[PDB]
């Protein structure tokens, strides 16, 4: 009945193929124990309205970053970042939606690469707003 | 007593003049039925503290994007995006405020143009945090 | 038991040294009276889960912007912005965490400079999600 997670990447993610899940290595919060770091997946524990937000810093290489917020296998919302130079830029978006118990929410690295360090530029959080 | 909307643009918005409302074509959520897609307006149904957030991806043209979050006819907070090249960039901000029943919250495209597609880069959400 | 602040900078901040606090001059909201504008500090009034978010627009000079969300003296999460030219760009991030009464949350300008005007590009908000 109370759910809130906040996760960060503290090391770089540069997958060898397109459309890979963004796994996280650190949790700033995991109230309700709903977030699986190793899979990078939020497991919905109760039917309700949930809020999600993410900020992904891209690696400082001249290659764009595309990120999707996913519900199961569906793209919900997306973000783009590109510096037009070997520099960082940030891909961010948010969503509010009704979920059912068992729904999985996760972040997909469609294309590009993500910067991770102990300063936690690259973050992903969500919480239960209204139960039902 | 429970209010949450999340809207997206799935087609481009390139108004012919400055200071035009950002209309939305798709709702990811409309708990409480407070958001009018066609006008792009949130109609406050009850006095309370509300949270708003937006992410607007600009068209890939060398022209900056300025967006205002509006309360009735007043600029509340603003966002800027510019790539310095024919590339996308994202204008985002947020606000938390006390509203009265009948207040209207909406997004204004001050200058520039907004990218819309089925991948839903360009989003606008809000919700009731505390009733009163 | 109900806490929500939203603050903005309406004038430029260009500190003479690294790692300075971002003070705010304007409050869009201060439900619970927890935010000290002059220090730019949120004073946690009750143990609970809190959400924070910020958007900082950098000055239009070719110098990057680094911002940290701080808990007492600890970096929680960070943001970067750079245009690669004399142009604005936005440093944003968010976090959800458990705090105790007496904890202080604030924004640190690690390096760079922040743009402030009446259009309120540069914002910082937080609220109590769950008391306990």
Swiss-Prot record, chains A, B, C:
It is found in: Cell membrane. It comes from the Eukaryota. Changing residue 127 to S: No effect on homotrimer formation. Ca(2+) 2 binds at residue 89. Ca(2+) 1 binds at residue 83. Changing residue 119 to S: No effect on homotrimer formation. Detected in all tissues tested with highest levels of expression in brain and spleen. Residues 1-132 form the C1q domain. Disulfide bonds: none annotated. Homotrimer; via C1q domain. Found in a complex with LRP6, CCNY and CDK14 during G2/M stage; CAPRIN2 functions as a scaffold for the complex by binding to CCNY via its N terminus and to CDK14 via its C terminus. Interacts with LRP5. Interacts with LRP6. Belongs to the caprin family. The C1q domain is essential for the function in Wnt signaling. Promotes phosphorylation of the Wnt coreceptor LRP6, leading to increased activity of the canonical Wnt signaling pathway. Facilitates constitutive LRP6 phosphorylation by CDK14/CCNY during G2/M stage of the cell cycle, which may potentiate cells for Wnt signaling. May regulate the transport and translation of mRNAs, modulating for instance the expression of proteins involved in synaptic plasticity in neurons. Involved in regulation of growth as erythroblasts shift from a highly proliferative state towards their terminal phase of differentiation. May be involved in apoptosis. This is Caprin-2. The gene is CAPRIN2. The chain holds residues 996 to 1127 of 1127 of the full protein.
């Amino acid at each position: 009945m109370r759910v809130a997670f906040s996760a960060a990447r503290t090391s770089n993610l540069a997958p060898g193929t397109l459309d890979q899940p963004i796994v996280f290595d650190l949790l700033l919060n995991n109230l309700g124990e709903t977030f699986d770091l190793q899979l990078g997946r939020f497991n919905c524990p109760v039917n309700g309205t949930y809020v999600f937000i993410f900020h992904m810093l891209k690696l400082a290489v001249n290659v764009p970053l595309y990120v999707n917020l996913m519900k199961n296998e569906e793209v919900l919302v997306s973000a783009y970042a590109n510096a037009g130079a070997p520099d960082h830029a940030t891909a961010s978006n948010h969503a509010i939606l009704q979920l059912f118990q068992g729904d999985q929410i996760w972040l997909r690295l469609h294309r590009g690469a993500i910067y991770g360090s102990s300063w936690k530029y690259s973050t992903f959080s969500g919480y239960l707003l209204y139960q039902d």
